[PDB]
Amino acid sequence: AKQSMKAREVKRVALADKYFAKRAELKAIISDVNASDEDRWNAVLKLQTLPRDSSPSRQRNRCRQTGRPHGFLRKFGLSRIKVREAAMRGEIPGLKKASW
Amino acid sequence: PRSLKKGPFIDLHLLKKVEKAVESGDKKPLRTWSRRSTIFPNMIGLTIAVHNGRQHVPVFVTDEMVGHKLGEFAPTRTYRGHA
């Protein structure tokens, strides 16, 4: 992926981090039953105004070095090839060939 | 579909527009680049220019449309036939 796409991604996570507390509490009011009907509806409208990016579903997992949006792995981060590269040269602490 | 516990979802920009429209009896088409909203009882009889990707299709909200979203009434693909 291009450098620009990586720049857009870090902006998405940064914006979500700043409004993380507001989103957590606002959704709690929505989810919680027994809350006033008018209160719940206002909470919905507030989330709309609230910048889209701030939603944690707006982030795409990308390689921390190249930004590839596909083939990502939570564990070891990196990406498909990137894992190998580090593991291959001897930078990953413990990985090796599996012959079970 | 959307959960019943969350009620209907409407865009505030469109929502603001209809409020002004109903209090003034406006008949001009409502310009909107959004389709995620749902049909409300207070939009009955209005004409909304719903974006389809390149143009805004005017749709006249009727009584039977209540409860549905704006998206179901704006086809996005132009398909005539394969021959």
Partner: peptide
């Protein structure tokens, strides 16, 4: 009918 009647009862109408 019902399109509005359904909407009425199903949603709290805030």
């Amino acid at each position: 009918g019902g399109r509005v009647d359904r909407f009425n009862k199903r949603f709290n109408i805030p």
